[PDB]
Amino acid sequence: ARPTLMPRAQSYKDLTHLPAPTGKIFVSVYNIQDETGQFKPYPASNFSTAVPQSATAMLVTALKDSRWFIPLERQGLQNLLNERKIIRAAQENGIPLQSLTAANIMVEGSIIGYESNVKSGGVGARYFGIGADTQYQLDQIAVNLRVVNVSTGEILSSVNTSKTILSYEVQAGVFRFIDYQRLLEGEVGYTSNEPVMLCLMSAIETGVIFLINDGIDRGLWDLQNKAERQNDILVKYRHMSVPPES
Amino acid sequence: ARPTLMPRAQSYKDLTHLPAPTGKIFVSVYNIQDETGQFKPYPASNFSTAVPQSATAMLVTALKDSRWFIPLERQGLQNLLNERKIIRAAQENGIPLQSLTAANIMVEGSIIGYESNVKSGGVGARYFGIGADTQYQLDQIAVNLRVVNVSTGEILSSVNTSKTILSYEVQAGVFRFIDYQRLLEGEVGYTSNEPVMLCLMSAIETGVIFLINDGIDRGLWDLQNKAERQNDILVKYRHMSVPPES
Amino acid sequence: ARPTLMPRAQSYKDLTHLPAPTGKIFVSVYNIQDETGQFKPYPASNFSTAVPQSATAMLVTALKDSRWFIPLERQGLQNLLNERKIIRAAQENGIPLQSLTAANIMVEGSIIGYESNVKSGGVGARYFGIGADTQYQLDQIAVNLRVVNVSTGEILSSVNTSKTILSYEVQAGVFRFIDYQRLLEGEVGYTSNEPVMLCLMSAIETGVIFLINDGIDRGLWDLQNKAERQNDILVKYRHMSVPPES
Amino acid sequence: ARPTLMPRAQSYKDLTHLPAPTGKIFVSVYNIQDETGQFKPYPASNFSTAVPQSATAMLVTALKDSRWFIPLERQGLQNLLNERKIIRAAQENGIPLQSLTAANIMVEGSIIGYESNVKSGGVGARYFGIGADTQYQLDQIAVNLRVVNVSTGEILSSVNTSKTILSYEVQAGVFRFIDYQRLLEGEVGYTSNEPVMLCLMSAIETGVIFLINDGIDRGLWDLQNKAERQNDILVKYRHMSVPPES
Amino acid sequence: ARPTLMPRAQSYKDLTHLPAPTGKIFVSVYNIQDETGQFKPYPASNFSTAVPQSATAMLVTALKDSRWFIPLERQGLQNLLNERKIIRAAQENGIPLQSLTAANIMVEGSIIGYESNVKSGGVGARYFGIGADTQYQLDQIAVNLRVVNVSTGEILSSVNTSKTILSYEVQAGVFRFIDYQRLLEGEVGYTSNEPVMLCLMSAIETGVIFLINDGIDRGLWDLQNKAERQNDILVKYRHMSVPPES
Amino acid sequence: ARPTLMPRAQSYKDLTHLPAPTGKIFVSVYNIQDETGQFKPYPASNFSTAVPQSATAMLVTALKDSRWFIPLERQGLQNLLNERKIIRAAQENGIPLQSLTAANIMVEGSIIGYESNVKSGGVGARYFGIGADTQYQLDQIAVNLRVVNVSTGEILSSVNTSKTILSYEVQAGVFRFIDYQRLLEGEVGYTSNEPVMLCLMSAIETGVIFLINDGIDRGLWDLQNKAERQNDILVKYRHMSVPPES
Amino acid sequence: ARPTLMPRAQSYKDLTHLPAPTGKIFVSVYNIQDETGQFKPYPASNFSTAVPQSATAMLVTALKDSRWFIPLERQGLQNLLNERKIIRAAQENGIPLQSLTAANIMVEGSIIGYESNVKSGGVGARYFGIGADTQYQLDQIAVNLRVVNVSTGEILSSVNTSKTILSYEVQAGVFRFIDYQRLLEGEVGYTSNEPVMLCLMSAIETGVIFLINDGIDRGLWDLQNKAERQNDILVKYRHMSVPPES
Amino acid sequence: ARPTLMPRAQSYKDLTHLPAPTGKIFVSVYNIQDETGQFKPYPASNFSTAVPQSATAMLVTALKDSRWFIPLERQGLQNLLNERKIIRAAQENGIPLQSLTAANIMVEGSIIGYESNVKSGGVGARYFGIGADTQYQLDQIAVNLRVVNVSTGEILSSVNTSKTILSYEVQAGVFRFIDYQRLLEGEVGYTSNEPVMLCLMSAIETGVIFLINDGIDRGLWDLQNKAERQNDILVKYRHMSVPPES
Amino acid sequence: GTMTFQFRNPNFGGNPNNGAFLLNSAQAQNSYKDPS
Amino acid sequence: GTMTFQFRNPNFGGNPNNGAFLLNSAQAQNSYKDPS
């Protein structure tokens, strides 16, 4: 096909239309570790991880496009410090650069577990020759995000989100004897694996709005206008603040 | 589906409605090690661990939402100390930050073993063509949590909790000869693996309430009101203080 | 089901009702190494250990609930020393902490071997269509515990305990021809693996009482009252002081 | 066949005809990490990565041929610094070289996940002997690119792109009995795997134009002529600035 | 069943009733290395060692219960020295401990080889339907122990012991046709693997008595009474002092 | 069975009855490396070595019981030096030990190769139902030992020995039809693998006598009496001084 | 059987009867590396090397028994230097040793490749029931040896030798029907793998005589008598000085 | 068979009869790396390299026997420098050695790739019972050698050579029914793998003559007599100086 | 452990080795004769 | 997990072990006699 932007869920359109704050908040995003410890089963490789190791690149895109935070490069800090030695070596030899911008808070977190085959199922039916069947699985991924006050070392707010990755498959088939000593045959199949790459981005973009909403109730950072406290987006994520039961 | 919060058991609603203490207690949560040493069997990978390595991110969410403890960032301490060098380098060049908040106690612990296939079973039945069957397994996970007084190095209280992870499967089936030289066929199946990701969170959130309850009987920390000593939650976890037999 | 405490054998109720000593004895529990060197066979993973690596977390729970010892944090000593640097850095900047409590003895030990399939067996029987069978295995685990006088470096007492882990399986079955050209079928099965997680805790909790009993006969530490020397618990573990034969 | 240049998509002809800026912008491209963590399944090797590790060599070719950036060697910096020790050793012994050119911005990024078998399918049909079938899979790759201001450490713009890698297969076949006791047979097959090597280059060359376009709207760097703001290329990538839905 | 002491062979009752010496001899037991280099075959894991790595914990129990030696902690010396830094840090801040007790001799050694399937065998018999069979294997383990004079570095005495680990299996079976068109079936089986964990302890406890007996003939250490030189135990291990032939 | 000494070949009785020298010769035995590089084939583990790694513990037993050499602890020298720091620390605090005894020569060597299946064979025979067969293999192990003068660094004498490890198997069998519609069946089998653990000890104990005999002809060390030069043992190993042909 | 010396080829009897030189030449033999890089195929282990790693112990035996060279311990030099620290520590405390003997030349080399299945073959024949067959393989090993003048660093002489390792197998068999409804059966087999352990020793012992012969023609070292230049051994290895063709 | 020299191709007889130069040229041969990265397929081991790692020992034999170069020991330089410390330690204690000879040029290079199964093929034919077949493969190996001027660091000449390794197999067979109810059978087979050990030596010995010939045309080193410029050997390698086409 | 769903029928996605058992256990139980 | 599409027919790309079941379950259901 053609290259385009990464496709986005309802939460990304729900994230962009957030109310604006008074001033933007700097944030250091160091590392979101893949602490699932779960690899892909057969017939994949023994080494391929179930969740991609790039959750820290997805969170920076969530914070930057939210129009609330100004993210700072702390992932490739060792490459950024090696670049600022090269500018400083050319300064003394034939504008002076200022120091690095430092953040008030640092958002860090994990990917707390990935369970595959939480539920399964399947229907099938064959009359005389003609058949059809269905299958589905759904895996569950969970993301932990917490805001750390870097001044004192405390933890301000911590939320857990979740997402269900549905992977179904529909297949038909015909194996009959049409009129004597002739044999008909046909198959039509279709599968659809939802990518865990794209369901991780929709669970992180939702967990950001639970951090921004929890900052307003706890008085951490205030909105630009108090009349926009009753926005339809923030009243939608306040009903989801209680978790589902089990 | 849609992203939401991580689903919570009865213990989380049992944890939030705890009585309030006099003052909040700081706590350092360094590392909860996966000391099970148990990996997933075939047909999963040889490398995938049976229990996720993110138990330390689950305990901080249990302590923070309990409204008793103020957790402190000690997991990513090496990233937090590297951030406070960048602020301090911009302080001398063109508000002074205070030191890190230190804790009175430090909650640490482990995951003491994970045994798979503790019990099993299964029924089956086939009359003329029509069939049905059932299966179930249940695994057992155990969590150790202990409170360490960091002033003297003693151990104040230590509790062990447990949880049973049921994983059943129901399947039907029909393979008959309906009226001469025609063949009917149908299958309906359904499995349900309970996630070990979610049963680890319910065993940790229960083991926190056995630490808070054991602090009140031993005089470690006292409640805000002594009339709330007879709460229905704390009288429920005092009956469970004796272990089951074997 | 519901989360609860870890289920306990007869030895835990036998451990709690011990007589009280004159004063509690501090103890350092550094590391109990899994020196079995035995991994799980097929169809488990090649990497999963047969005995969990968390025996040092189980012994601290045995010593703490015995109401004789005050255990000290020496497992996570490197995390406890890093915490006391953070308090000491905030002391000089804008109560002085005392030093770590040190122990008189240090209980250390191992897990001396785990042999699987020590005994086996099985019965089976089929008459006309109807059948039944049984199987059982029993594995053997052994725990070494020894008390080290830390003043001189000697070894005061050393005991070995053992436990047999029974794992049976009962299965029925019917494959008959009921009245002409109909076919009956039924299966009922049930297995029960005793967890090695829970049989390790019952062998450690028994080996503690053989250390406390051996301290009284050797004059290491004395009871609070000499009339309680003739307790029914201590007279029960004196008959078991001679080992079984082979 | 014959060696030639690497074949290029529509985006490369779309990249070369961009409007010219006022002055060229230096850029350091250190490392684009393969953070997919996904390896190739059977019957390939267990060790072969799904995405090539050479994305940092592809981005430099995209920046250099865009006629906007002057890329700088920062990948083999340790080899370039060892060369400048050899020139400097021959300078003191029997033109003095200037220092390294340093960049204003540094483009860095990742490959955020690679999901294989996102969709599948297949048709088949056999009448009397003569048959035909079809298959197709399509994998999805995603590339993260972000521009880091190296003076302050902020992140200026960050975009995500995506690409679908179609891999189909068409096969015919005949197995008949032509006139008595003779047997005809024929097969014709054809597959076509689109290379992930070449679809990674088309997703990076598209993500560069989303960085150049986002610089003009945010006032980072301005065009040479404001009448060329309404170019047909830049108005084409402004309609694609909103992502697809899911 | 119930936890108990580790079951002991004839040699342990033969070890406890040894004559008493003049004074007890200190001994350092550093490490008994598993130098077999033999792992368990299929269907066990590739990684599980044939002999447990805990022979050094078994020898200390043999020396301590022999009522001749006072063993010293030299295995966990790095943990014992870290404990004595904590006492010494609390000494200068608000009884002085003496130095470590040092030994006259140090008993060290190895496990010299483990050969599996030294001998095998098996009988079988089936008449009309009714059957029975038998199998047996026997493995051979060997233990080296030597006493090192730590003053001069010489080797005082060195002995090799051996043990045969029998593992048999008995199985019956019936597959007949009882009265027309009925089918009887029955199986009864029983195996018994002798543990290599327990046969290593009986080869070490025997090799200790060959060290104590060889000390009396060489004048290394003398008995408390010379009339007890003619004990029935020491005259039993003097007849076994010559090895079997091959 | 019962524990006993390791069974010994003809060479051990041939080694003990050697003539006595003038004075005993000290010897350092550092390490005999398993330089075979040969592991065990299927169905054993991939990791289990064919020859045990404990040849250095077998040579010390050969030198000590030969009544010619006084061996010195140089294998666990790092443990012996750590013990003599503990005595020396208790000397200055509230008999002075002499230095380590040093050797005139140092016996070192290797295990030069282990070839499996050098020869094989097998007979079989079946008449009407009744059968019998035989198999045998023989492996070959070789041991290098050389005496190094530690004063100058020269090599005084070097010998190579060899041993053949026979492993046979005898099996019978009956599968007949005794009187009409009855079926007899019987099997009797027996294998015998000679241990490579025990054939390594008999090749080392022989290679010691070729070192002691070569010392007398070269004038390295002389006998106590020259009339015992014509002993029946030393005249037996002088005929074997020429190697077999090939 | 019985232990004996390692069996020797024609070259060893050809090596011992060499003419005597004027004076013996010291030689350092550091390491002969197994640079084949070839491991054993199935059904052996994946890790077992095709050629043993002990070629450096075989060359020292070739040089020592040649009555021309005096070899020096340079393999275990780190053990020999640790021994001479122990003598020197006892010298200053309550004969002074001279320095190590150093060599004029140092013989070093490699094992240049090992190719398995260079040639193969096999005959078979079956008439009515009675059969017979034959197989053979032959592998090829090559040894490089070169003499290095240690004074200047030059290479004096370098030779390559080779050897063919034949491994045959002969098997018979009978499967007939002797007189009606009786069945005869018999098999007789025999294999013989020549050891690569023993063919490496015969290729090294031959390559030594090509070094000694090349020293006399180049004037490196001269014989004791010039009349012995025309020996039958040295005139035999001068005809083999030209290589075979290919 | 019997040990002999390594068999040599036409190029070795073509190398020895080269014209003589004015003076011999010293050369350092450090390391020829196996940069093929190709291992042997099934049924060999996974670890065995396709090309031996001893190409640096083969090149020194090519340079030494060419009667043009004097090679220097630079492979085992760390062993040669450790030997010259031992001579120098005996010099000061109770002829002074000169420094190492250093080279004008240093020949280094690689093994640029090894492709297996470049071509294949096979014929077969069976009439009534009697059959025959043939197979062949041919692999391709390539060697890079380049002369480095060590004074300035330039590269003087660089050549690539190649060789084709043919491996064929011929097999016959008979499976007939000779006169009624008798069965004849016979097989005759023969394979021949050309060793890659020996084809690497013939590609290196050819690549040396392309270096010596390229030195004379470029004026690097001149012949002893200009009348020998027109030798039949050097005019033969000048026609091969142009490569084959593809 | 994990309970993964699989069809027991080789017509759908399932193991093909119990195809010969599924058909032989169906023709051993049918009682429909040929109508004519 | 991942749902990979595979044909259930050995004529197309599929497992060959259910070929003998696919044909035996088709000839046990056909009702077409020989026309003549």
Numbering used by the authors:
A (entry chain H), B (entry chain I), C (entry chain A), D (entry chain G), E (entry chain B), F (entry chain C), ...: 10 to 103, 111 to 262
I (entry chain R), J (entry chain Q): 1 to 36
Question: What text comes from the article?
Answer:
The curli biogenesis system in Enterobacteriaceae such as Salmonella species and Escherichia coli (E.coli), also known as the nucleation-precipitation or type VIII secretion system, is responsible for secreting curli subunits into the extracellular milieu to form cell associated nonbranching and highly aggregative amyloid fibrils. Lipoprotein CsgG forms a nonameric secretion channel in the outer membrane and transports CsgA and CsgB from periplasm into extracellular environment. Two soluble accessory factors, CsgE and CsgF, have been thought to bind to CsgG and play a crucial role in substrate (CsgA and CsgB) secretion and curli amyloid fiber formation. To address these questions, we determined the structures of complexes in curli biogenesis system by electron cryo-microscopy (cryoEM), including CsgF and CsgG (CsgFG) complexes both in the free for and bound to the N terminus (residues 1–22) of CsgA (CsgAN22).
The CsgFG complex structure was determined by single-particle cryo-EM at 3.8 Å resolution without any imposed symmetry. CsgG and CsgF were observed to bind together at a 9:9 stoichiometric ratio. By imposing C9 symmetry during three-dimensional (3D) reconstruction, the resolution was improved to 3.38 Å, which enabled unambiguous model building of entire CsgG subunit and N-terminal domain of CsgF (CsgFN, residues 1–36). In the 2D class averages, the CsgF C-terminal domain (CsgFC, residues 37–119) showed weak densities on the extracellular side of the channel, which reflected high flexibility of this domain in the complex. CsgFN was inserted into the CsgG channel β-barrel to form a layer inside the CsgG channel. Inside the CsgG channel, CsgFN was properly folded and contained a short α-helix. Each CsgFN subunit binds to two adjacent CsgG subunits mainly by hydrogen-bonds, electrostatic interactions, and hydrophobic interactions. In the presence of the CsgFG complex, we observed another pore structure formed by Asn17 of CsgFN, which was slightly larger (diameter of ~10.3 Å) than the one formed by CsgG (diameter of ~9 Å). Three phenylalanine mutations (F5D, F7D, and F12D) abolished the interaction between CsgF and CsgG. CsgFC was flexible, and was observed as fuzzy densities on the extracellular side of the CsgFG channel, which should be responsible for interacting with CsgB.
